Amino acid sequence: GMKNLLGYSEDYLKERKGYITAKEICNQPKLWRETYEIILSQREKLKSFLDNFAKKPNAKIVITGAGSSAFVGNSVVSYLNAKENIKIEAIATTDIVSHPFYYLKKDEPTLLISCARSGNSPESTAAVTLAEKIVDDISHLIITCNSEGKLALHAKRNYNSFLLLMPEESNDKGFAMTGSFSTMLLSCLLIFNLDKLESIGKQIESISMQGEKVLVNNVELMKKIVGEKFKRTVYLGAANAFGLAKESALKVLELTAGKIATLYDTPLGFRHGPKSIIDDETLIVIFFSNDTYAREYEYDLLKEVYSQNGNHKVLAISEYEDKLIEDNSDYFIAINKEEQEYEDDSFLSLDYLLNAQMYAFINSMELGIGPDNPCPTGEVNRVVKGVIIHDY
Amino acid sequence: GMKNLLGYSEDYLKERKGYITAKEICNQPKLWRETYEIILSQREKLKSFLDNFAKKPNAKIVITGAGSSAFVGNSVVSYLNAKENIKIEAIATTDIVSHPFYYLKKDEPTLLISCARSGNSPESTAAVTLAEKIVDDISHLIITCNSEGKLALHAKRNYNSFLLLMPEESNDKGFAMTGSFSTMLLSCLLIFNLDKLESIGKQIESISMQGEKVLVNNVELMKKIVGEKFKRTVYLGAANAFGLAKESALKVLELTAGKIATLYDTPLGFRHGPKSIIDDETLIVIFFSNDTYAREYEYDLLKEVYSQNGNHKVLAISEYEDKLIEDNSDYFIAINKEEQEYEDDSFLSLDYLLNAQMYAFINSMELGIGPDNPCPTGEVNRVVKGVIIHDY
Numbered sequence: 153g154m155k156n157l158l159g160y161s162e163d164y165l166k167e168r169k170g171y172i173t174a175k176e177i178c179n180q181p182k183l184w185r186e187t188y189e190i191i192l193s194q195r196e197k198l199k200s201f202l203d204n205f206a207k208k209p210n211a212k213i214v215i216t217g218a219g220s221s222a223f224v225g226n227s228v229v230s231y232l233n234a235k236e237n238i239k240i241e242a243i244a245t246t247d248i249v250s251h252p253f254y255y256l257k258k259d260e261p262t263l264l265i266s267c268a269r270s271g272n273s274p275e276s277t278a279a280v281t282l283a284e285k286i287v288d289d290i291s292h293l294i295i296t297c298n299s300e301g302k303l304a305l306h307a308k309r310n311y312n313s314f315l316l317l318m319p320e321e322s323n324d325k326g327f328a329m330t331g332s333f334s335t336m337l338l339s340c341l342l343i344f345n346l347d348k349l350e351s352i353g354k355q356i357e358s359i360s361m362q363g364e365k366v367l368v369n370n371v372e373l374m375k376k377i378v379g380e381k382f383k384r385t386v387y388l389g390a391a392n393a394f395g396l397a398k399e400s401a402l403k404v405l406e407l408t409a410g411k412i413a414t415l416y417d418t419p420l421g422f423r424h425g426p427k428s429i430i431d432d433e434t435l436i437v438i439f440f441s442n443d444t445y446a447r448e449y450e451y452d453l454l455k456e457v458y459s460q461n462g463n464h465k466v467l468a469i470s471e472y473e474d475k476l477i478e479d480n481s482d483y484f485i486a487i488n489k490e491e492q493e494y495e496d497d498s499f500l501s502l503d504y505l506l507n508a509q510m511y512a513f514i515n516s517m518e519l520g521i522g523p524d525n526p527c528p529t530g531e532v533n534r535v536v537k538g539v540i541i542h543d544y
Numbered sequence: 545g546m547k548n549l550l551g552y553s554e555d556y557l558k559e560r561k562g563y564i565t566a567k568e569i570c571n572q573p574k575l576w577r578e579t580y581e582i583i584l585s586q587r588e589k590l591k592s593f594l595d596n597f598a599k600k601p602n603a604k605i606v607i608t609g610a611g612s613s614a615f616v617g618n619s620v621v622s623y624l625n626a627k628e629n630i631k632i633e634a635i636a637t638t639d640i641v642s643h644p645f646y647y648l649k650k651d652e653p654t655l656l657i658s659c660a661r662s663g664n665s666p667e668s669t670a671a672v673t674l675a676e677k678i679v680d681d682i683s684h685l686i687i688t689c690n691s692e693g694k695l696a697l698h699a700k701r702n703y704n705s706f707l708l709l710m711p712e713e714s715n716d717k718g719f720a721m722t723g724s725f726s727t728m729l730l731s732c733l734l735i736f737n738l739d740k741l742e743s744i745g746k747q748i749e750s751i752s753m754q755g756e757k758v759l760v761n762n763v764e765l766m767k768k769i770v771g772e773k774f775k776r777t778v779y780l781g782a783a784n785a786f787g788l789a790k791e792s793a794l795k796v797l798e799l800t801a802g803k804i805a806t807l808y809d810t811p812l813g814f815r816h817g818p819k820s821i822i823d824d825e826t827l828i829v830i831f832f833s834n835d836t837y838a839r840e841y842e843y844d845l846l847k848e849v850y851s852q853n854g855n856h857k858v859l860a861i862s863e864y865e866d867k868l869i870e871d872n873s874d875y876f877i878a879i880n881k882e883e884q885e886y887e888d889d890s891f892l893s894l895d896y897l898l899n900a901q902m903y904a905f906i907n908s909m910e911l912g913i914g915p916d917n918p919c920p921t922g923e924v925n926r927v928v929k930g931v932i933i934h935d936y
Contacts, residue, residue, distance in 0.1 A: 247782070254783060413776065415805075423924070423928050427923065427924050452931075531820075
């Protein structure tokens, strides 16, 4: 017997320079249990820090990050903004840094939730340092995977700051953020549910267990899907799944070195022009809502794209098995047998995401690429190069 | 002598079923003067309607639409949210309709600014009708080009409503929204500047005059650009120009029937993975800010993409002539000789947009497509087909 990760051997992976990103993807289930424990242990410290900020009049919370780290905010804020009275917004560091005066005001108390894997993106640091320049009552929750990260080090400055470190193994040394992304997603969801942590702990355990199953059981199915040498991939997800779509679109793009063209949208939104993208070498992936009302729209959109000539292919991903989806799909993946309970549909992204990462990764492996560094020539990088921060 | 539109004859355009979309694009300059006049004549009526709503505690404004009409909000809200105390957000109808309870609350007075060309998108009507179901203090500003539109007709219902009709000629009968988009962009910008209409009228005149010049003078330059049979196009725009990027990306996609793969991003944001898209058959277009601080970042990003091997091509678009940009660019377009004054950089989109529409259109014409209806087979449509609205 010999170890396999994602249908491949540790020796075969090290060969085509791809081991690093492979372990880090399969480690996500443990990382999530690890992440829950971190938030639970910091519960009392986070509760008082968050409730003290929240009482400040005209207060708002901005979840910020660059690239895959920006998509963290997008993947949660629809839910969180609707759960909490206080304004919770996703504004990328790569937007704050070019136009700080559209997003930061002197008389507006602000909590910046900074997300970052390395913490070594210049925008990550310059966003924090612009906030300090412009806002009177500014506070920082730093969610980072890298304690030696530049961003993390600002915990030691004379700022109002909380350093919430992800697990050490979550500083993905591979090009693509995997467990860096997902732990930071889960963390944003748990930190406004300190109310309900014990009962949500039961959910995270279920998500982790079915996650381990995604990584073993969906390998063969994924391998037949990649074999089609798809030259385009579309990811569709409504509301919180929109964020998951942006990241899923990004990882398969990143890891193929721009050999597979990507596009992301919502299902309803897809019809209004973007759909034009569908050629015969296109895969369409659609993530399904458990919200019964929102789901209805996803059925109809699935039926429509599966029907429209062209032999092109659609993979449907649902939390529970569904005859109606399976009989209107090229490829089908279900996370569980029967619908499991969750605080909100934002929580479905974790098990959904895995599959996206696997398609991303397996495409890279099968196209001849080295997933750990799909751009060895360095046009794009793990840590962003050539970003000059300019004078305030 | 014989009439030419966009380098082509009215007889040559009618041949390859493309006249409709061509006139409508070249009419935008007049439409804008027409749109200014409409807002000026309704000034007193709009001022009291907007200030009466604005006084309501916990009030927010949501600019909504589907597809190209959603991008209207995206193209203005960065500016408008930063100008006004009251929350101004872009939330697409194609998001409200799947998850109304993330975006509408009983105790939260809400003004829905509905944008739509035809007003015949089912989502446009269902968004308004969900708002009525859920919100106590709900008001509607309907900005539509189609007085016979389904959306327009709701002006006659027992709702709090203001029907702000665009000009009649702005109900683009062509597939692609051109003057429908741009008049609705300008309208959202003028309606929160009723303060300053006379002095902004001088700006709109300048924008219209240089717009007529874009459509005549940039034709030859655009024609050489299309000749490269680009198989990918990237549009980069920061803040308000992000919206312009989404629409510019969409129109060249729409009009080629998904023969030219598109992607949109901000310049700073582009580096963090999405950039992977750059192959040798890619055009990168970058819209420039006049904000001196924000512009600095766009210089550096331009230098970087123009440098990186691959012979692929980058077209830079600036409001004023700039030696530094021209010497770091394959193709260059300038709107004016010297920097003109504007209330905010959101106003630069109008003259910028034209060029995008021209590239979109000319690609369609030169690829053999009929731009009036680039999907005659009806996979995508002018008015959205197969949208079922489900039971509340």
